[PDB]
């Protein structure tokens, strides 16, 4: 599932919990897939890393919701000691306030991404949705 500028995002609101799994070809986030030797390359990777380390900002989860990070995983060689995987588990005090999900912010911060294919699974059932910077909201 590897198309440059296209990323998959699986969501799952289960009571308090919210699980976001983002699989993306590395081209969208760092701007290449050759492991980083240069300094321009190493700063582009650390820029991405510290943006992905702040998932309440990227996914623009409302403050009103009481959202805190329980666990976060960035599977890629580029962030150890080519695709990128980014798994967040969140715990929202007031999950009822999570009415809507804005990738608008994600697009601003990784403008290399033109389309995000979204599999949401609520307690309502299962809903697909393609998101572009134009049309980047999803009724949760
Ligand atoms: Zn590629
Ligand atoms: Zn994972």
Residue numbers in the entry: 15 to 95, 121 to 179
Task: Provide the authors' original text about this structure.
The structural and zinc-binding properties of PA4063, one of the periplasmic proteins expressed by Pseudomonas aeruginosa under zinc-deficient conditions, are presented. PA4063 has a noncanonical ferredoxin-like fold. These findings strongly suggest a role for PA4063 in zinc trafficking, possibly acting as a metal chaperone or as a regulator of a transport system.
The structure of PA4063 in complex with zinc was solved by soaking crystals in zinc acetate solution since crystallization did not occur in presence of zinc. Soaking experiments were first performed with hexagonal crystals, despite their lower X-ray diffraction power, due to the poor reproducibility of the tetragonal crystals, leading to data collection to 3.3 Å resolution. Diffraction data were collected close to the absorption edge of zinc (λ = 1.27 Å) in order to unambiguously locate the metal. Two strong anomalous peaks were observed for each monomer (>9σ), revealing two binding sites, according to the ITC experiments, indicated as site a and site b. Site a is located on the flat surface of the β-sheet in correspondence with the histidine residues. The same mode of binding is detected in all three monomers of the hexagonal crystal: besides His124 and His126, the zinc ion binds to Glu87, likely as a monodentate ligand, and a water molecule, adopting a tetrahedral coordination geometry. Site b is about 20 Å from site a, on the edge of the β-sheet where the His-rich sequences are inserted. Notably, a few residues belonging to these sequences, which are disordered in apo PA4063, become structured and take part in zinc coordination, although some variability is present. As for site a, the coordination is tetrahedral and three donor groups are provided by one glutamate, Glu47, and two histidines, His16 and His18. When evaluating the contribution of the His-rich sequences to the binding and the structural variation thus induced, it must be considered that the zinc-bound structure was obtained by soaking, thus the rearrangement could be influenced and limited by crystal packing.
